[PDB]
Amino acid sequence: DMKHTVEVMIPEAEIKARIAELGRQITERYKDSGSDMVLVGLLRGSFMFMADLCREVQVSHEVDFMTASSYGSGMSTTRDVKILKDLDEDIRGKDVLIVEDIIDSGNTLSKVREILSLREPKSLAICTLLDKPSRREVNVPVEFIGFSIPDEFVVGYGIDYAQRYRHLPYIGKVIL
Amino acid sequence: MKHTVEVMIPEAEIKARIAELGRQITERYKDSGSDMVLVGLLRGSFMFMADLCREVQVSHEVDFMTASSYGSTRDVKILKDLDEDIRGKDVLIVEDIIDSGNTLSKVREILSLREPKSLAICTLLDKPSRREVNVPVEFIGFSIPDEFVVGYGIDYAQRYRHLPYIGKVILLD
Amino acid sequence: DMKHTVEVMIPEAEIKARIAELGRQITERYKDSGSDMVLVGLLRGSFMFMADLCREVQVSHEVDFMTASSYGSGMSTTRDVKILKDLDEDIRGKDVLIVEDIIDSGNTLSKVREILSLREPKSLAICTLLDKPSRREVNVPVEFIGFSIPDEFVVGYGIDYAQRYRHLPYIGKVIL
Amino acid sequence: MKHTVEVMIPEAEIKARIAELGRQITERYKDSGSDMVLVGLLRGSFMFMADLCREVQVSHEVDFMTASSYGSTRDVKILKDLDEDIRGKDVLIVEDIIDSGNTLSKVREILSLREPKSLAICTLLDKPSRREVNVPVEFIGFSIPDEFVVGYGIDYAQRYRHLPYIGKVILLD
Ligand SMILES: O=c1[nH]cnc2c1ncn2CC(COCP(=O)(O)O)COCP(=O)(O)O
Ligand SMILES: O=c1[nH]cnc2c1ncn2CC(COCP(=O)(O)O)COCP(=O)(O)O
Ligand SMILES: O=c1[nH]cnc2c1ncn2CC(COCP(=O)(O)O)COCP(=O)(O)O
Ligand SMILES: O=c1[nH]cnc2c1ncn2CC(COCP(=O)(O)O)COCP(=O)(O)O
Ligand SMILES: [Mg+2]
Ligand SMILES: [Mg+2]
Ligand SMILES: [Mg+2]
Ligand SMILES: [Mg+2]
Ligand SMILES: [Mg+2]
Ligand SMILES: [Mg+2]
């Protein structure tokens, strides 16, 4: 809780345009699979990205969600990744696309991929809106990236700052 | 069951209606002063929540619950509770369809125990005909007859959640 | 995490004897109900008490469990009581006995009773192994009490001290 | 289905067998030095856990999980995860019956990802005949034939969990 301002990093229109492209790419990849497809969102951060993204995915798919253990940025480095809420549906034999808002360290996401892989989906890929590779701690396969971004603390579009700013239609950055 | 899907409420009409809802919601809670939170019932309300919260011009938090779903006489149970506290906060439950009102009626009671400052419901679709339990609903996007609709988060055997419009399922025979 | 010792407060044999009595009383109360009965344990603390107690309850019943939000002793006074894991079964129209290890302030237990009451069981009662009334903050109906105890920090028999001592077969007290 | 319940494994034999199990478990982990935790799969293992941990003469934590149960080809899902971390700890999964081994096999894989120091399984009952997936089981209370048993945490349509013995259900006709 410290005095700050929020500057725009990615305007609403740019996000919309990029997600349209992501949609085309994801559609092109999975259109001929013939197996069931499901987009899996990591709550809470990816709810907005999921809503906009799945509307641009022109393939019959299911939408499902998952809540993994959060903790701080410092305790997440030393604590187990736990399932606070598992999927509602099966993914065995299905094309699964994990929908993430932002990959910073990539710790939690890495563990989540491992967990879902045990369920033997036909395929398992990740789509993140934002990637901050300067902050990457764990090597993790990421098939779709909306934006590779600077080393900034970002907010908006589902992403929060102490539970604040999730409803912003753009990606902003916190300036102390 | 062989079927098809026709547009009932176009994407453009949904967007317009939500913008209006956002203005109404903004107006009711603008001078509250207390923390505000929009609470979505998963999975159905995720898309409605995304668009709606972007039209609410009040600083608020977004949270989610998952209540037990059995289909069309069992206990309403919490599969996933809120992540944050709501005591002393303005709380708006965000729902996709109100039909029988059973689950939502119980979810409201459960949240009411936590003593929020206020507690209200916003639903995209309302089917007044199928109501079994009378539950107050302050904000309503559309009132429809007893039609089986899909899209915009609403599914049919897990299908069609990703449609940008509300559509009607036409059974073929 | 501070240097301490554990002294016995209620020896294993005394717990066994008292639970036998509790069993007789609970049996006498519910033997003629004719409706289904379920004992509901609040995890993790009441797992041992539940195992021993239900074996002394000579009435056909179901065993179910529930995990409510924990937090510290200081944050539990200002945070909502949340359901981390709800019951597996319905309780509507059933005789429900909530099985608790210890009632200190009684905050969390109070809220849990409220939540279960919404499901309209035929009856709803509470059985706690230990009651510490000197520390009671909220007035809550408690139908069965194993022991009313001094203002001591107790451990053992499911009850922990920073996750420690749950497996002790007796009730002990922490001495700094 | 009309039935009755006869004693198969008396309360006294269960107690004796568990005391022995406690000694074996105590011996294997006494000189480990790392934190130890017993992990029970709910609901079946709550009674077995209670008695077993009281016979384990090693300082340990007790925790629980609830995995998806569907009955006698779906994903194993976590309805309730551990409350505590297990990385670098000696972990003993405490189970009531091993039968097909399906759920337990998946639960072990999930916990294995968290990199505990060691990972083992203790089950009260083993039915080797019904095994579909080979999963290592270090400690076993009793090996039984393919019998439908109840009691000691094990249920039949939610019934008989509170029986202090293992019993067999006799169908009547
Ligand atoms: O710029 C950022 N903006 C808001 N959050 C960030 C940012 N960077 C890292 N975080 C924190 C987390 C998001 O979790 C938010 P929380 O659970 O509410 O504390 C990054 O996602 C997990 P990972 O680092 O493994 O990819
Ligand atoms: O047209 C419809 N299309 C798809 N479903 C419908 C429709 N109509 C009623 N449903 C079923 C349900 C949605 O079920 C919630 P879920 O099982 O968690 O996905 C409406 O809830 C009744 P209410 O909110 O009044 O208690
Ligand atoms: O003597 C005591 N011994 C161990 N614990 C105690 C005692 N006293 C109060 N506690 C803490 C809590 C138990 O929670 C343990 P936690 O979630 O792991 O921190 C008392 O139960 C809740 P309430 O106070 O509302 O009846
Ligand atoms: O004699 C039996 N009596 C009551 N049940 C039995 C028996 N035999 C196999 N079951 C069913 C199950 C118990 O189901 C766990 P739940 O649904 O969460 O309560 C044994 O699990 C098979 P495995 O552990 O090898 O994966
Ligand atoms: Mg996130
Ligand atoms: Mg955060
Ligand atoms: Mg709904
Ligand atoms: Mg407790
Ligand atoms: Mg504690
Ligand atoms: Mg089991």
Short mmCIF file of N, CA and C in Angstrom, two decimals, chain B residues 70 73-87 106 109-110 113-115, chain C residues 71 78-92 111 114-115 118-120:
data_model
loop_
_atom_site.label_atom_id
_atom_site.label_comp_id
_atom_site.label_asym_id
_atom_site.label_seq_id
_atom_site.Cartn_x
_atom_site.Cartn_y
_atom_site.Cartn_z
N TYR B 70 -26.39 -29.42 -10.03
CA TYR B 70 -26.89 -30.78 -10.21
C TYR B 70 -27.79 -30.89 -11.44
N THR B 73 -33.29 -30.39 -5.62
CA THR B 73 -33.74 -30.91 -4.33
C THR B 73 -32.56 -31.31 -3.45
N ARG B 74 -31.35 -30.96 -3.87
CA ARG B 74 -30.15 -31.21 -3.08
C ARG B 74 -29.65 -29.92 -2.44
N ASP B 75 -28.77 -30.05 -1.45
CA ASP B 75 -28.21 -28.89 -0.76
C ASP B 75 -27.37 -28.05 -1.70
N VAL B 76 -27.46 -26.73 -1.57
CA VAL B 76 -26.53 -25.86 -2.28
C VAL B 76 -25.23 -25.83 -1.50
N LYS B 77 -24.16 -26.32 -2.12
CA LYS B 77 -22.87 -26.40 -1.44
C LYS B 77 -21.83 -25.53 -2.14
N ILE B 78 -20.83 -25.10 -1.38
CA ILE B 78 -19.75 -24.27 -1.91
C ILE B 78 -18.57 -25.11 -2.38
N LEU B 79 -18.40 -25.21 -3.70
CA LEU B 79 -17.28 -25.94 -4.27
C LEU B 79 -16.02 -25.08 -4.24
N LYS B 80 -16.22 -23.77 -4.35
CA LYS B 80 -15.13 -22.80 -4.24
C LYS B 80 -15.68 -21.49 -3.72
N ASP B 81 -15.22 -21.08 -2.54
CA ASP B 81 -15.68 -19.85 -1.90
C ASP B 81 -14.94 -18.64 -2.45
N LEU B 82 -15.36 -17.45 -2.02
CA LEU B 82 -14.65 -16.21 -2.35
C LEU B 82 -13.20 -16.28 -1.89
N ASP B 83 -12.33 -15.55 -2.58
CA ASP B 83 -10.94 -15.41 -2.14
C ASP B 83 -10.81 -14.26 -1.15
N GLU B 84 -11.72 -13.29 -1.22
CA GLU B 84 -11.62 -12.10 -0.38
C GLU B 84 -12.83 -11.91 0.54
N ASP B 85 -12.64 -11.09 1.58
CA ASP B 85 -13.72 -10.75 2.50
C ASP B 85 -14.71 -9.77 1.88
N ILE B 86 -15.96 -9.81 2.34
CA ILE B 86 -16.98 -8.91 1.84
C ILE B 86 -17.69 -8.15 2.95
N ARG B 87 -17.32 -8.42 4.20
CA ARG B 87 -17.92 -7.73 5.34
C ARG B 87 -17.74 -6.21 5.22
N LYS B 106 -29.89 -19.33 -2.32
CA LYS B 106 -29.06 -19.89 -1.25
C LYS B 106 -27.70 -19.21 -1.18
N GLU B 109 -28.10 -15.98 0.68
CA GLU B 109 -28.21 -16.22 2.12
C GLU B 109 -26.84 -16.44 2.75
N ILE B 110 -26.02 -17.23 2.08
CA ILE B 110 -24.68 -17.56 2.57
C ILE B 110 -23.82 -16.31 2.67
N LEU B 113 -24.72 -13.74 5.52
CA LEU B 113 -24.17 -14.04 6.84
C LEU B 113 -22.87 -13.29 7.14
N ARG B 114 -22.16 -12.89 6.09
CA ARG B 114 -20.86 -12.25 6.26
C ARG B 114 -21.01 -10.75 6.46
N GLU B 115 -22.26 -10.30 6.50
CA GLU B 115 -22.60 -8.90 6.78
C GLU B 115 -21.92 -7.91 5.84
N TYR C 71 -6.96 -19.08 9.34
CA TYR C 71 -6.26 -17.85 9.72
C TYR C 71 -5.67 -17.98 11.12
N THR C 78 -11.39 -10.77 12.39
CA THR C 78 -11.70 -9.69 11.46
C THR C 78 -11.92 -10.17 10.02
N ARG C 79 -11.81 -11.47 9.80
CA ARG C 79 -11.99 -12.04 8.47
C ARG C 79 -13.28 -12.86 8.39
N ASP C 80 -13.84 -12.94 7.18
CA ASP C 80 -15.02 -13.76 6.93
C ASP C 80 -14.69 -15.23 7.13
N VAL C 81 -15.67 -16.01 7.58
CA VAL C 81 -15.52 -17.45 7.64
C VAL C 81 -15.91 -18.06 6.30
N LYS C 82 -14.95 -18.68 5.61
CA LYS C 82 -15.19 -19.23 4.28
C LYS C 82 -15.14 -20.76 4.26
N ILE C 83 -15.77 -21.35 3.25
CA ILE C 83 -15.78 -22.79 3.10
C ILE C 83 -14.65 -23.24 2.20
N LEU C 84 -13.62 -23.86 2.77
CA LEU C 84 -12.51 -24.36 1.98
C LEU C 84 -12.85 -25.72 1.38
N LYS C 85 -13.69 -26.47 2.10
CA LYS C 85 -14.21 -27.73 1.60
C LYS C 85 -15.56 -27.97 2.26
N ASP C 86 -16.61 -28.02 1.44
CA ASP C 86 -17.95 -28.23 1.95
C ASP C 86 -18.18 -29.71 2.20
N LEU C 87 -19.33 -30.05 2.77
CA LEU C 87 -19.71 -31.44 2.98
C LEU C 87 -19.79 -32.18 1.66
N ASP C 88 -19.66 -33.51 1.72
CA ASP C 88 -19.82 -34.34 0.54
C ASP C 88 -21.28 -34.72 0.34
N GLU C 89 -22.06 -34.64 1.42
CA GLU C 89 -23.44 -35.11 1.39
C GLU C 89 -24.44 -34.05 1.85
N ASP C 90 -25.71 -34.28 1.54
CA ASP C 90 -26.79 -33.40 1.98
C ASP C 90 -27.13 -33.62 3.45
N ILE C 91 -27.67 -32.59 4.09
CA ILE C 91 -28.07 -32.70 5.49
C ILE C 91 -29.52 -32.28 5.69
N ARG C 92 -30.17 -31.84 4.62
CA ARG C 92 -31.57 -31.44 4.70
C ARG C 92 -32.43 -32.57 5.25
N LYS C 111 -20.31 -19.29 12.93
CA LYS C 111 -20.62 -19.04 11.52
C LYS C 111 -20.95 -20.32 10.78
N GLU C 114 -24.46 -21.40 11.44
CA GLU C 114 -25.35 -20.58 10.63
C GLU C 114 -25.45 -21.09 9.19
N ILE C 115 -24.30 -21.39 8.60
CA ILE C 115 -24.26 -21.87 7.22
C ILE C 115 -25.03 -23.18 7.05
N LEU C 118 -28.94 -23.07 7.15
CA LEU C 118 -29.61 -22.67 5.91
C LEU C 118 -30.06 -23.88 5.09
N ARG C 119 -29.45 -25.03 5.35
CA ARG C 119 -29.75 -26.22 4.57
C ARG C 119 -30.91 -26.99 5.19
N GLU C 120 -31.45 -26.43 6.26
CA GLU C 120 -32.65 -26.95 6.93
C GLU C 120 -32.55 -28.42 7.32
#
